[PDB]
Amino acid sequence: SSDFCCPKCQYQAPDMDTLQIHVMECIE
Numbered sequence: 001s002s003d004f005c006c007p008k009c010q011y012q013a014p015d016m017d018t019l020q021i022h023v024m025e026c027i028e
């Protein structure tokens, strides 16, 4: 439910905000 997934690893964030933060952390 509201699964914002990181196109770099298996990570689905509940918030789109969280996704943005994660993606900019998920540089590796």
Ligand SMILES: [Zn+2]
Pocket (backbone or CB within 6 Å): 006, 007, 008, 009, 010, 011, 022, 023, 026
């Ligand atoms: Zn990621």
